[PDB]
């Protein structure tokens, strides 16, 4: 068929304070738009992390990794943070819990 396989709805990407501070330290605007395009076609494209409440990790820069939460009803993505491949790739409980907290902090801003 003509239209490519995936989702084609108006969508919103929402940078967090962290992601906005550190985005351009990592991604050229081409890389960033390619990333949002990929998620817009397919949310659920990132690998789930458990204990987080639905946060996902995508690895496309290279070794850049973004962590995001897609909001089911409002069709907004929360871009939580971006970290490089070499750098802290060690996932522990203090991390998963605080990520879940800030994620829920955005989540309950628009009921």
């Amino acid at each position, epitope marked *: 068929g003509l239209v490519p396989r995936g989702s084609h709805m*108006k969508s919103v*990407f929402v*940078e967090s304070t962290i992601f906005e501070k550190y985005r351009d330290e990592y991604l050229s*605007d081409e890389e960033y738009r390619l990333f*949002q395009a990929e998620l817009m*076609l397919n949310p659920k494209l990132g690998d789930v992390i458990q204990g987080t409440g639905g946060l996902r990790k995508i690895r496309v820069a290279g070794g850049s990794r973004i962590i995001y939460y897609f909001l089911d009803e409002k069709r907004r993505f929360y871009l939580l943070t971006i970290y490089g491949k070499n750098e802290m790739s060690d996932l522990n409980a203090n991390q998963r819990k605080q990520l879940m907290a800030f994620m829920e902090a955005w989540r309950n801003e628009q009921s």
Partner: nanobody
Amino acid sequence: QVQLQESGGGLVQPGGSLRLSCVVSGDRRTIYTMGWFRQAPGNQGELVATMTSSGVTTYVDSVKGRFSISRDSAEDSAKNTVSLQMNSLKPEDTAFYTCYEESRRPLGSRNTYWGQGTQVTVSS
């Protein structure tokens, strides 16, 4: 909130012209950048064109000379309409075309808004 409604698309003869269009309204915000993306089936998509709030544009190499991005501020009160003008359409330009716009409301989030998209089929 911020409203995005887009227009244009369909289906065109080679060498013909089509204007895609895409409007962002709501109340006031600071606009950073804004562009168009395209994706044909089976392969990775490609960013078609970009324009900073300063006018700085990029275009991809395959569309150089033929597509043009332009903009309309509506006094910079209100809305900006972004237009993709496509001329001398080649069949390689057949793709699903989406627009986007980064922008930051007062005391608000740096968001990039994305369109539904629209299929553009350039077939002999």
